Amino acid sequence: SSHHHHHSYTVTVATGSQEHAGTDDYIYLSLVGSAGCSEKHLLDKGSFERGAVDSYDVTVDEELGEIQLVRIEKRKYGSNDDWYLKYITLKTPHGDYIEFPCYRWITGDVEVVLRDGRAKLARDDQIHILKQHRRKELETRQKQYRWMEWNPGFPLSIDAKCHKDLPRDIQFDSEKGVDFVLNYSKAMENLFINRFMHMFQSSWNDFADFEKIFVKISNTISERVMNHWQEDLMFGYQFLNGANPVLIRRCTELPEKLPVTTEMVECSLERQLSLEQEVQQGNIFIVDFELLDGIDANKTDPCTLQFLAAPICLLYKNLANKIVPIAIQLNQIPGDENPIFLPSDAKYDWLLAKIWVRSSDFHVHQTITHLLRTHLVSEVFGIAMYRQLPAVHPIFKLLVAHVRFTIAINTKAREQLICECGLFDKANATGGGGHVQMVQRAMKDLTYASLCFPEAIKARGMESKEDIPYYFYRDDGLLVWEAIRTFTAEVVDIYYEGDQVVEEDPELQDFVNDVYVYGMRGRKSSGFPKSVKSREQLSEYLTVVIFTASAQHAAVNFGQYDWASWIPNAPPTMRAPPPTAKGVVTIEQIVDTLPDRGRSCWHLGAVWALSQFQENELFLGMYPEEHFIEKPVKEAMARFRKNLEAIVSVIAERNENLQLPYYYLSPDRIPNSVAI
Ligand SMILES: [Fe+2]
Numbered sequence: 001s002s003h004h005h006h007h008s009y010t011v012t013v014a015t016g017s018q019e020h021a022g023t024d025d026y027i028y029l030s031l032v033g034s035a036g037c038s039e040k041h042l043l044d045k046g047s048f049e050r051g052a053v054d055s056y057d058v059t060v061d062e063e064l065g066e067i068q069l070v071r072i073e074k075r076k077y078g079s080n081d082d083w084y085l086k087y088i089t090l091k092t093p094h095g096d097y098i099e100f101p102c103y104r105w106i107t108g109d110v111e112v113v114l115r116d117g118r119a120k121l122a123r124d125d126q127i128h129i130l131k132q133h134r135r136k137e138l139e140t141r142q143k144q145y146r147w148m149e150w151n152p153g154f155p156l157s158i159d160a161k162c163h164k165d166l167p168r169d170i171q172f173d174s175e176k177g178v179d180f181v182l183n184y185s186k187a188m189e190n191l192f193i194n195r196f197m198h199m200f201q202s203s204w205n206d207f208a209d210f211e212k213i214f215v216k217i218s219n220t221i222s223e224r225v226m227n228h229w230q231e232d233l234m235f236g237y238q239f240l241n242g243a244n245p246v247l248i249r250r251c252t253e254l255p256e257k258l259p260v261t262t263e264m265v266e267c268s269l270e271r272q273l274s275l276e277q278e279v280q281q282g283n284i285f286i287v288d289f290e291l292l293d294g295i296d297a298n299k300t301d302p303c304t305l306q307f308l309a310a311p312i313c314l315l316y317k318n319l320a321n322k323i324v325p326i327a328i329q330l331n332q333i334p335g336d337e338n339p340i341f342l343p344s345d346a347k348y349d350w351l352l353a354k355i356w357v358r359s360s361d362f363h364v365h366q367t368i369t370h371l372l373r374t375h376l377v378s379e380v381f382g383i384a385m386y387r388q389l390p391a392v393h394p395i396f397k398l399l400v401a402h403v404r405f406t407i408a409i410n411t412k413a414r415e416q417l418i419c420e421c422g423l424f425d426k427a428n429a430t431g432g433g434g435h436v437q438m439v440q441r442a443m444k445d446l447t448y449a450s451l452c453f454p455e456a457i458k459a460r461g462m463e464s465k466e467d468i469p470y471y472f473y474r475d476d477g478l479l480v481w482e483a484i485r486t487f488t489a490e491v492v493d494i495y496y497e498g499d500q501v502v503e504e505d506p507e508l509q510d511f512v513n514d515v516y517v518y519g520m521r522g523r524k525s526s527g528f529p530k531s532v533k534s535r536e537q538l539s540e541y542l543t544v545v546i547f548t549a550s551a552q553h554a555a556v557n558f559g560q561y562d563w564a565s566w567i568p569n570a571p572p573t574m575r576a577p578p579p580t581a582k583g584v585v586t587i588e589q590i591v592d593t594l595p596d597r598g599r600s601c602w603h604l605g606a607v608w609a610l611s612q613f614q615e616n617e618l619f620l621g622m623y624p625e626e627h628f629i630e631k632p633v634k635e636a637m638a639r640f641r642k643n644l645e646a647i648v649s650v651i652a653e654r655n656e657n658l659q660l661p662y663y664y665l666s667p668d669r670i671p672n673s674v675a676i
Helices: 128-144 180-190 207-214 220-228 232-241 275-281 347-388 394-402 406-417 434-443 453-459 472-495 499-504 506-519 535-557 560-564 587-593 597-610 631-656
Strands: 002-005 009-015 026-033 053-058 067-075 083-091 097-106 112-115 284-288 312-317 323-329
Touching: 009 026, 026 083, 067 083, 067 097, 067 128, 097 112, 112 128, 128 347, 180 406, 180 597, 207 220, 220 560, 232 323, 232 347, 232 472, 275 284, 323 347, 347 394, 347 406, 347 434, 347 506, 347 535, 347 587, 394 472, 394 535, 453 472, 472 535, 472 631, 499 506, 499 535, 560 597
Parallel strands: 002 053
Antiparallel strands: 009 053, 009 083, 026 067, 067 112, 083 097, 284 312, 312 323
16 A cells, blocks of 8 residues: 655655545645745656555755645646545654644645644744744635524524535535435335335334334344333333433422322322422422424324424332333323323323323434534534634644534535425424424523533432432443543643633634634523633533533434334324323324324334444544644543543443443444534
8 A cells, every 4th residue: 555656855645545535636745844945746646546655755956944834736637536635744854754634635626735733822833934824724714614594593504505515624525425315215225114115194004013014123222112112111211321311300399380299199109208208309300391382293294194292291219219200291281181191090091191202202302402412513613613723723633533524414414304395304293394493492591501411410400329320321421521521631731731821822712702603693691601711611611522522422313223213112203182181092093193104114214324333433532533643642542542441341341230231322332423
């Protein structure tokens, strides 16, 4: 893979490994020294092939001094062969070895100009050559990466209508590599379900009819779900360790809108305390779907009415310290057509009440927990990073690995999935616009504090491991949060000698300010910082960014097939309204309320496709793109990787004693960024 060209500097040029990384176009290189610039040098005609390392001897007509910049210019040979340049290194006549990180796609359209890889704040740059490069880099970034309002009240996102319109630097490696249209359909073939793809008016004949399809495609967890989804324990388990474990709260007072009494739930209580006494002891929990109240249901199929609820589910920590459901009201305002269902009800009344809660959990999961609170948030940070932090800045070098492919996957989603008449409308009862309404309503509670994982856990009253022992999302989340916090605090400490340097960093300030003003729409109640004035505040902010993009996304994304493939445990839609009376519903009715065959197919393809890892996925703390080249930061990265490996072992030992292992937050399964 290594080609040495001999006719002085030795210039090493490293081409990417991605499929189309290579180029046959003319490549010119110049060196900018403090004492002068070199000539433009055509690097020996030929092809920089995928994965290539080419070395060239380059003799200069004059002494240049310390090399400050390297300039690359791609000129056309034949047609446009985009080029992925990983890095350039220099061995100088004076014997020094200088690395210039790039990690960028180079189209013929503009010269690329690189600093050496030592990280620099603006205050480090005092000579004109460097100040001009830095300022021009930011001017160009701010023309190429612009903010846009895709839907009213949303966090602002990238100003591009489709993926092909993005700057090449932030596109996927290919145009059809990661594609919702192609991958959802590919999923339905691999899952063997393609004959039913568009059968949107046909119910399953019974549970057995769907089981026949499911058993061929189940995995370990989803097979357990199929066998156990009717159990109260399995239903309650998911609020702590399922796909959406972020909603449950410790109840400190029973809400007036839920007129439940001790007599109603006395059979569930196990301590000879009244319900009001259980509340006060900390044994009562609540999941409250107020956000779904008044969301429009999908009306895009006139032959299929679809329906949403907005339930309140009351839960109890029993004598085994397991949290189990004790009461379910399917809508927000109580009354005689909004019954409080109970585990003492007729079998299928209580089962259906639980299905409605699971369906509601799925809706909030897809649109709020996952899309808004990890995808759109991560994209806000990535756009702000590109607009305001030059590539030589240490926070750019730190964060660029954690926003990889984020704008690309979100733009594909707005292009194909969640746009009007996109794929999301096919199976989901919030399709057709209710999902946009939910985002608008959740925005008003997307706060900074809600992204600070320890505080957010405490805000829900769920922090006590002694009182609430089987919350593995919490336990693993806290360890990973602290690992990132430790890593970011060290990086900050290397490059920022004190708080005044943080406060005076104009690019950092503009980064934070773009997130507040554009990303968060300038809402004071968001609690986002308008500026950052200390090293500790910066460390916490960078942890919010990285944790949201890696750990939080992984926890809520990669258990989607596990928990939602068995459709009764997570219906994407319901084809009858919630039951208004006890003693009526039958199992046959439930079958006809659950998704039709077509919606089931699209749902399974979607949760399968979205739960996949890539063959060379980058997991947390894997940084093959060496933006950082300096020894102190590389030692910080090594300590990060060691802290993470210790967490892997903690989780592995914990999981061996568990009925259902919880592994979404094992760091060896957490990708660096939102990329799917
Ligand atoms: Fe995702």
